[PDB]
Scaffold this active site. Structure first.
Site, mmCIF file in Angstrom:
data_model
loop_
_atom_site.group_PDB
_atom_site.id
_atom_site.type_symbol
_atom_site.label_atom_id
_atom_site.label_comp_id
_atom_site.label_asym_id
_atom_site.label_seq_id
_atom_site.Cartn_x
_atom_site.Cartn_y
_atom_site.Cartn_z
ATOM 1 N N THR A 95 0.848 -1.183 0.000
ATOM 2 C CA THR A 95 0.000 0.000 0.000
ATOM 3 C C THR A 95 0.886 1.236 0.000
ATOM 4 O O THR A 95 1.814 1.341 0.808
ATOM 5 N N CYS B 15 3.529 0.247 8.751
ATOM 6 C CA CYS B 15 4.453 1.270 9.250
ATOM 7 C C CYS B 15 4.213 2.558 8.458
ATOM 8 O O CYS B 15 4.791 2.759 7.388
ATOM 9 N N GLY B 16 3.373 3.429 9.014
ATOM 10 C CA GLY B 16 3.126 4.718 8.388
ATOM 11 C C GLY B 16 2.529 4.575 7.002
ATOM 12 O O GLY B 16 1.533 3.874 6.796
ATOM 13 N N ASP B 17 3.146 5.252 6.031
ATOM 14 C CA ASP B 17 2.658 5.244 4.659
ATOM 15 C C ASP B 17 2.864 3.907 3.960
ATOM 16 O O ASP B 17 2.316 3.708 2.871
ATOM 17 N N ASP B 18 3.631 2.996 4.551
ATOM 18 C CA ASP B 18 3.907 1.696 3.962
ATOM 19 C C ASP B 18 3.346 0.602 4.861
ATOM 20 O O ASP B 18 3.252 0.763 6.080
#
Lengths: 324, 333, 333
Positions: free
Chosen positions: C95, C175-178
């Site tokens: 994502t 983890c955050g944006d990933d």
């Protein structure tokens, strides 16, 4: 008052549930048109209703006790306790819906609850005089019966329960005082056929029994079924009916008793027109709205002036029946 | 694509008669325990615990073996197919349904499968089974039930004057999306499918091109029971492998050719391909124990050899000289 | 670009269930003292004093380690990624969010992050935390909370009949944006993002081009845990330096190549560039102690070397002969 506290505290209910499986199939069934072309026949509508109820009951796997006056005399057939009660066009046969509701069992009932004050139901002419529907079955005799107000607001009902003569002796001194053994039911009516909007598919589930005081009001204002009073007390000789449309419209149906002509109009328009001073003003406004049909404006004017006509009783020749 | 095409009034009586004939003499049943269901043969378990028992009891009974072929060994399947073709004197028809689970209507689902399950199981289990069916509406047994219902409808339409029990006694082998029926109702089957609202594909039996059933080709069902993988479906796609990318190509090819040997050892135009795959990808593949310990491992008569060769040629419409040239090209590569 | 796209009625129950599962067994918490927050790891401090404690307590708990990868060492990150890919058998989805902090809606902000913080912290600290959240509406933990909420929504949409706790127990690393997720919800993730009002970018895992995660490329996650800097993002821009003009080019290049050695020592097509930068700008750069005392200093497995080379070639779509020619050109300059 302190009397209200008595009723609030006196629950004394005995909930009974013989695992009557909810018939979700009957609830939330989309409108259907039985006849592919033309208009359906009364026998066809009856067959469709019977087929729908049969399919629902068999899919749920339960049993049924079809009824075809005060007591159903079910002893001659002794159905199971869990079986449902099913009746189709039994309005003429049953004196009251209480007869069906005393058994304290779920009821699936297909009834005549007209939204038009007169006209044709499928192929069967019908008309309302006094407060009794003079139904004329297509391919049958002439039925005279009232309507027992299934579709009024309120899902909770009060009804009698079966009582033996010994029970009658026990409860008569209590009954005269104003103590009654009352069961409660939850109603659902579907109105499943578009081409025949005058017939409703009533569905009912019992909830629990209670002992209630006759001369004490109820907090929830539970209602008991009563005969509909179609007669208009303001315009003698006329029948007035109101119903709510799916598109947020409150229409009204007007007509004379023992009479065939009938028109539906928005309620707001009828209230505006009923206050007009002059008869010619009614026609002027109606032409203003764009109603050019004489059959409509003439009936509206007649209702406005409360014109009574003693229509005669005349011989009728009915359509020949064909078994097909 | 959900559909709500209710059947006609007349068809309802036929469906009820078919359901009653399916019920037969097994009025009462009991659910299976979780442990027994687990050792039999999440989300699958909750429905399987009831459906496996229902199938084993009713669908595998004495009076329901005429049509419910689904649920038997491949040798049993071949024996049943040969017996059926001998009975019908090589006059049979094949039914091929497209997305049956995606096309069965609400009325069919609630009047065939739900009715059968409720009649088969005990009343005290009615709520659980009805809830499971409601969840299903919004696996294997459903397809067999649909095929049986359609066969019963066709038989009822063909002979409306015979008794329902005698009509149902003629139900031929049926297994999910595939089944067998008499060729005399080839044209009337389409009208029955239209009445129910289903789409049906039918093909007349042709000895020149063989018979298609369960992706299996009967080279000469009149005399021999020799059978092979369907050539039409697999030949055009066998050269391309649809395994997941994480598996090496060699392991997937080895598993495919091992299955083909297990099922199509002596089939022309496939044995050569399998042997060449085993020769090329074989040595380059990984250890077979490694793939046996790996999840993706399960994700895949000599007397009439001449007749099988000719039947395969007829199936693939390839000339014998062309077939020999192709065989030579495949072997020499 | 502020957005006010409230979610649907049904999604609210899913969000509440996800928030409750995030709460877990840590009902009560206490704020950290200013000194402890300062020694942990103005405007950042006032929110950090609470958010660091909240993360350390709840997001780093036993029952919240399945998804909250953010907050662990790179060796731990690599171990978690390898474990997750082994569990999913190389079947994972990635994502990539675009401006999540600039796209999260008011309803999401006030029903995920604010709810979680208020439930985690003590009632006597409600006013301070609510004021801080209100100031935020008009850092790191918010992205992780959004990713967890979107994962919970996807899991709820995939299996609406399972219990929320069991559904959330399957939450993969985020983890955050990933983040990582199962590939079976590749298409349904877009609909979930549309329902919440977020934009999602998804790519199927491909072993030929490697796996993208945290700007890190896994050459062969099935067997080895060797990992390298993302080549797609950095190769097209590594030749241009984005340092401030006041720093000499030599010092910035030296810091960049030192970081690359610290992270990408044995990566093809980057080691040669780093060595040539060290050879050219190295001697011409200033003293390293001078840049260590300068603010802008922080403003920047040998066995599978063949496989890493091939994976980098596949990532950069450059022919092996072309790769060798480029390597020769870089070294000889």
């Amino acid at each position: 008052t302190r009397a209200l506290q008595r009723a609030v505290i006196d629950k004394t209910k005995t909930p009974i549930e013989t695992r009557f499986y909810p018939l979700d199939s009957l609830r939330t069934v989309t409108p259907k048109r039985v006849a592919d072309n033309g208009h359906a026949v009364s026998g066809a509508v009856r067959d469709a209703a019977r087929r729908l109820i049969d399919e629902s009951i068999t899919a749920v796997g339960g049993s049924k006790f079809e009824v075809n006056d005060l007591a159903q005399d079910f002893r001659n057939d002794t159905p199971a306790d869990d079986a449902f009660i099913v009746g189709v066009d039994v309005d003429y046969y049953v004196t009251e819906p209480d007869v069906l509701l005393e058994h304290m069992r779920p009821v699936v009932l297909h009834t005549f609850n007209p939204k038009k004050v007169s006209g044709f139901d499928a192929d069967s002419p019908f008309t309302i005089k006094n407060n009794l529907v003079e139904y004329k079955v297509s391919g049958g005799a002439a039925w005279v019966h009232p309507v027992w107000d299934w579709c009024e607001a309120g899902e909770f009902i009060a009804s009698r329960v079966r009582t033996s003569w010994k029970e009658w002796f026990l409860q008569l001194p209590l009954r005269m005082i104003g103590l009654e053994k009352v069961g409660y039911h939850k109603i659902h009516h579907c109105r499943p056929w578009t081409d025949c909007p005058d017939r409703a598919l009533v569905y009912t589930i019992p909830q629990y029994v209670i002992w209630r005081f006759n001369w004490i009001d109820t907090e929830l204002h539970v209602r008991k079924l009563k005969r509909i009073e179609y007669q208009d007390e303001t315009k003698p000789g006329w029948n007035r009916l109101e119903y709510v449309t799916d598109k947020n419209e409150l229409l009204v149906s007007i007509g004379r008793e023992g009479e065939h002509a009938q028109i539906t109009i928005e309620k707001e328009k009828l209230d505006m027109l009923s206050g007009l001073s002059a008869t010619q003003s009614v026609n002027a406004r109606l032409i203003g709205m764009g109603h050019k049909d004489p059959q409509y404006t003439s009936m509206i004017v007649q209702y406005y002036t409360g014109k009574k006509v003693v229509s005669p009783i005349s011989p009728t020749v009915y359509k020949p029946t064909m078994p097909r | 694509v959900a559909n709500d095409k209710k059947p006609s009034d007349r068809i309802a009586k036929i469906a009820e008669t078919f359901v009653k004939l399916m019920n037969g003499p097994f009025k009462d049943l009991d659910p299976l325990s979780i442990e027994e269901t687990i050792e039999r043969l999440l989300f699958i378990l909750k429905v399987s615990r009831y459906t496996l028992a229902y199938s084993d009891i009713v669908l595998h009974a004495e009076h329901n073996e005429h049509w419910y072929y689904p649920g038997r060994n491949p040798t049993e399947i071949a024996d049943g197919v040969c017996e059926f073709v001998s009975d019908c004197d090589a006059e049979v028809i094949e039914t091929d349904f497209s997305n049956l689970d995606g096309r069965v209507s609400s009325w069919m689902q609630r009047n065939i499968a739900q009715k059968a399950m409720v009649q088969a199981f005990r009343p005290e289990y009615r709520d659980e089974i009805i809830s499971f069916m409601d969840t299903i509406i919004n696996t294997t047994p459903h397809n067999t039930q649909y095929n049986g219902c359609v066969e019963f409808t066709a038989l009822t339409f063909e002979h409306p004057d015979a008794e329902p029990e005698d009509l149902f006694r003629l139900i031929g082998p049926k297994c999910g999306d595939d089944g067998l029926s008499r060729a005399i109702i080839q044209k009337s089957i389409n009208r029955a499918a239209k009445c129910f609202g289903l789409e049906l594909k039918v093909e007349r039996y042709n000895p020149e091109i063989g018979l298609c059933f369960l992706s299996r080709v009967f080279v000469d069902p009149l005399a021999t029971t020799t059978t092979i993988q369907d050539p039409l479906r697999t030949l055009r796609k066998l050269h391309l492998t649809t395994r997941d990318p994480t598996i090496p190509l060699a392991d997937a090819a080895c598993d495919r050719v091992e299955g083909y040997l297990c099922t199509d050892a002596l089939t022309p135009l496939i044995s050569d391909y399998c042997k060449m795959v085993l020769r090329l990808y074989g040595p380059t593949a990984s250890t077979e124990q490694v793939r046996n310990q790996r999840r993706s491992r399960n994700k895949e008569h000599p007397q009439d050899a001449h007749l099988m060769k000719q039947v395969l040629i007829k199936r693939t419409a390839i000339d014998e000289d062309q077939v020999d040239a192709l065989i030579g090209r495949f072997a020499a590569m």
